[PDB]
Write an enzyme that holds these catalytic residues in place. Structure first.
Site, mmCIF file in Angstrom:
data_model
loop_
_atom_site.group_PDB
_atom_site.id
_atom_site.type_symbol
_atom_site.label_atom_id
_atom_site.label_comp_id
_atom_site.label_asym_id
_atom_site.label_seq_id
_atom_site.Cartn_x
_atom_site.Cartn_y
_atom_site.Cartn_z
ATOM 1 N N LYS A 61 -2.773 5.415 -5.211
ATOM 2 C CA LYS A 61 -3.565 4.261 -4.810
ATOM 3 C C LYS A 61 -4.839 4.835 -4.194
ATOM 4 O O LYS A 61 -4.790 5.526 -3.178
ATOM 5 C CB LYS A 61 -2.811 3.407 -3.788
ATOM 6 C CG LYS A 61 -3.479 2.069 -3.521
ATOM 7 C CD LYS A 61 -2.649 1.193 -2.605
ATOM 8 C CE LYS A 61 -3.345 -0.133 -2.348
ATOM 9 N NZ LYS A 61 -2.564 -0.998 -1.423
ATOM 10 N N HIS A 74 0.353 -1.845 4.584
ATOM 11 C CA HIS A 74 -0.676 -1.851 5.616
ATOM 12 C C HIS A 74 -0.308 -1.838 7.092
ATOM 13 O O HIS A 74 -1.195 -1.720 7.933
ATOM 14 C CB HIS A 74 -1.593 -3.047 5.361
ATOM 15 C CG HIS A 74 -2.173 -3.074 3.983
ATOM 16 N ND1 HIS A 74 -3.029 -2.099 3.520
ATOM 17 C CD2 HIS A 74 -2.019 -3.956 2.968
ATOM 18 C CE1 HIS A 74 -3.380 -2.381 2.277
ATOM 19 N NE2 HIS A 74 -2.782 -3.503 1.919
ATOM 20 N N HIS A 78 -2.820 -9.405 1.516
ATOM 21 C CA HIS A 78 -3.764 -8.457 0.938
ATOM 22 C C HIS A 78 -4.753 -8.010 2.005
ATOM 23 O O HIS A 78 -5.159 -8.804 2.852
ATOM 24 C CB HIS A 78 -4.485 -9.129 -0.243
ATOM 25 C CG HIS A 78 -5.845 -8.578 -0.545
ATOM 26 N ND1 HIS A 78 -6.043 -7.336 -1.107
ATOM 27 C CD2 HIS A 78 -7.076 -9.128 -0.407
ATOM 28 C CE1 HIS A 78 -7.335 -7.144 -1.308
ATOM 29 N NE2 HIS A 78 -7.984 -8.218 -0.892
ATOM 30 N N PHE A 79 -5.112 -6.730 1.981
ATOM 31 C CA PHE A 79 -6.077 -6.197 2.933
ATOM 32 C C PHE A 79 -7.373 -6.100 2.146
ATOM 33 O O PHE A 79 -7.498 -5.279 1.237
ATOM 34 C CB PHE A 79 -5.641 -4.821 3.439
ATOM 35 C CG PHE A 79 -6.470 -4.313 4.587
ATOM 36 C CD1 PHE A 79 -7.749 -3.812 4.370
ATOM 37 C CD2 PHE A 79 -5.988 -4.378 5.890
ATOM 38 C CE1 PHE A 79 -8.541 -3.382 5.436
ATOM 39 C CE2 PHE A 79 -6.770 -3.953 6.965
ATOM 40 C CZ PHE A 79 -8.050 -3.454 6.734
ATOM 41 N N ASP A 80 -8.335 -6.946 2.496
ATOM 42 C CA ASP A 80 -9.599 -7.000 1.776
ATOM 43 C C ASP A 80 -10.661 -5.989 2.195
ATOM 44 O O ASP A 80 -11.330 -5.406 1.341
ATOM 45 C CB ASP A 80 -10.168 -8.420 1.864
ATOM 46 C CG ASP A 80 -11.080 -8.754 0.705
ATOM 47 O OD1 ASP A 80 -10.681 -8.507 -0.453
ATOM 48 O OD2 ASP A 80 -12.191 -9.270 0.944
HETATM 49 O O1 LIG Z 1 -10.623 -1.421 3.025
HETATM 50 C C1 LIG Z 1 -9.802 -1.603 2.127
HETATM 51 C C2 LIG Z 1 -10.099 -2.033 0.797
HETATM 52 C C3 LIG Z 1 -9.112 -2.155 -0.097
HETATM 53 N N1 LIG Z 1 -7.796 -1.882 0.202
HETATM 54 C C4 LIG Z 1 -6.741 -1.982 -0.822
HETATM 55 O O2 LIG Z 1 -7.242 -1.412 -2.024
HETATM 56 C C5 LIG Z 1 -7.240 -2.408 -3.077
HETATM 57 C C6 LIG Z 1 -8.447 -2.208 -3.967
HETATM 58 O O3 LIG Z 1 -9.661 -2.284 -3.193
HETATM 59 C C7 LIG Z 1 -7.168 -3.737 -2.342
HETATM 60 O O4 LIG Z 1 -6.622 -4.739 -3.193
HETATM 61 C C8 LIG Z 1 -6.261 -3.399 -1.159
HETATM 62 O O5 LIG Z 1 -4.891 -3.294 -1.515
HETATM 63 P P1 LIG Z 1 -3.911 -4.567 -1.401
HETATM 64 O O6 LIG Z 1 -3.919 -5.011 0.055
HETATM 65 O O7 LIG Z 1 -4.440 -5.634 -2.348
HETATM 66 O O8 LIG Z 1 -2.552 -4.041 -1.833
HETATM 67 C C9 LIG Z 1 -7.426 -1.484 1.480
HETATM 68 O O9 LIG Z 1 -6.270 -1.259 1.803
HETATM 69 N N2 LIG Z 1 -8.465 -1.361 2.370
#
Ligand SMILES: O=c1ccn([C@@H]2O[C@H](CO)[C@@H](O)[C@H]2OP(=O)(O)O)c(=O)[nH]1
EC number: 4.6.1.18
Length: 124
Positions: free
Chosen positions: A41, A12, A119-121
């Site tokens: 992804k 991210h 984690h990016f929610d």
């Molecule tokens: O606006 C958003 C929403 C989700 N995510 C990433 O995609 C995974 C599933 O939603 C989320 O779990 C997250 O990935 P993670 O950070 O968990 O690796 C984004 O990057 N941006």
């Protein structure tokens, strides 16, 4: 091994560019950051602010995480970000994404000591 904090930075963080993500940005970045190794992804967001500014969000507005957990935080200020969303015709390993720049408040989940983003929610 790669820590959860390090993984967050890899998936991210992209401080370099002040945000000028070309229409090709996501295709490049999602591959370069190893986010299309085992699969494409579906959704991934890159933040263009400094690491310090993003890490600081862990002490900002506490909000509920989409999964119901309580450890999410929303940035008070808006941040420069780039959203990457897999196209409907994307065919692994040839992962294709739509690149969309924006300035929104980010919501990240934080854990550990130091308490940092893991984690990016979402963005709002
Ligand atoms: O606006 C958003 C929403 C989700 N995510 C990433 O995609 C995974 C599933 O939603 C989320 O779990 C997250 O990935 P993670 O950070 O968990 O690796 C984004 O990057 N941006």
């Amino acid at each position: 091994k790669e820590t959860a904090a390090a993984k967050f930075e890899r998936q991210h963080m992209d401080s370099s560019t002040s945000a000028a993500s070309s229409s090709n940005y996501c295709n490049q970045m999602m591959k370069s950051r190893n986010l299309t190794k085992d699969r494409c992804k579906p959704v991934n967001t890159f933040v263009h602010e400094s690491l310090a500014d993003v890490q600081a969000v862990c002490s900002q507005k506490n909000v509920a995480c989409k999964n119901g957990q309580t450890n999410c935080y929303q940035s008070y200020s808006t941040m420069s970000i780039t959203d990457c969303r897999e196209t409907g015709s994307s065919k692994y390993p040839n992962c294709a994404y739509k690149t969309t720049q924006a300035n929104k408040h980010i919501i990240v989940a934080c854990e550990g000591n130091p308490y940092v983003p893991v984690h990016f929610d979402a963005s709002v």
